[PDB]
Amino acid sequence: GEPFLIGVSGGTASGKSSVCAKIVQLLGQNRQKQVVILSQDSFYRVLTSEQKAKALKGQFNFDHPDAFDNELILKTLKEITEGKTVQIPVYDFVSHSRKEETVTVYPADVVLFEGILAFYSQEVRDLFQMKLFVDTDADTRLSRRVLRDISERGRDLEQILSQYITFVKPAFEEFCLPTKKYADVIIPRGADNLVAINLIVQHIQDILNG
């Protein structure tokens, strides 16, 4: 069959992955539908030595649409829509290097693609049969983002905040937030909005059933 591709966007630490996890979990509550969640973060571009030098100095914008391998995203997603098995790269964010190992993703009935810029490119955007944007208060997101980067990346607090003000927040307002208008459903308060998520799940189930 043909997979049902769902695109999920939203600002940093807005709860995109939590909303996808909730969707899969509620899909199984109601044979079973196979569901897989993909992340745009897996498709960061391979950096040159100069770009990696700027990144280690905190001078590379990883929130700009150019930072993502949009060509690899488009090709991976188009092969999924045609029902094939694909290989997903494994990107190391602490070292800014795409690892050699890949992850095999077998065909599923529903595929969720989440990322801060999932709706930016028009070609990938037209592949999504449903599009969701996760909305969360900017300070709530920042404090999640700060705790997340302190532990998962081991970075300094002052350097996290200066990176946020320099790159993350401006790129959100210039590149991510405008893609909100392409969303079929906008979800305020993220995964805690179980009412909205339940409507989305019921909509997904009715499209697959008939």
What count of residues does the chain have?
210
End-to-end CA gap in the chain: 14
Q: Site for ligand KEA (CB under 6 A): which residue of 27, 149, 191, 196? A: 149
Phi, psi of 209 (to 5 degrees): -75, -40
Instruction: Using the minimum distance from each CB to a second copy, give the nearer residue, 92 or 156.
Output: 156
Q: How far is the CB of 57 from ligand KEA (least distance, A)?
A: 13
23 counts as binding a second copy under rule CB under 8 A: no
125 counts as binding a second copy under rule CB under 8 A: no
Residue 154 per-residue DSSP state = -
Q: Site for a second copy (CB under 8 A): which residue of 147, 148, 152, 208? A: 147
What residues form DSSP beta bridges with 89?
A: 102
Measured between alpha carbons, how far is 96 from 103 in angstroms, rounded to an integer?
A: 18
Going 89 to 172 to 138 to 59, the CA torsion angle's sign is positive
- Which residues make up the interface to a second copy (CB under 8 A)? 64-66, 122, 130, 133, 135, 137-143, 146-147, 150, 157-158, 161, 164-165, 169-170, 173-175, 177-178, 180-189, 192-193, 195-196, 199-200, 202-203
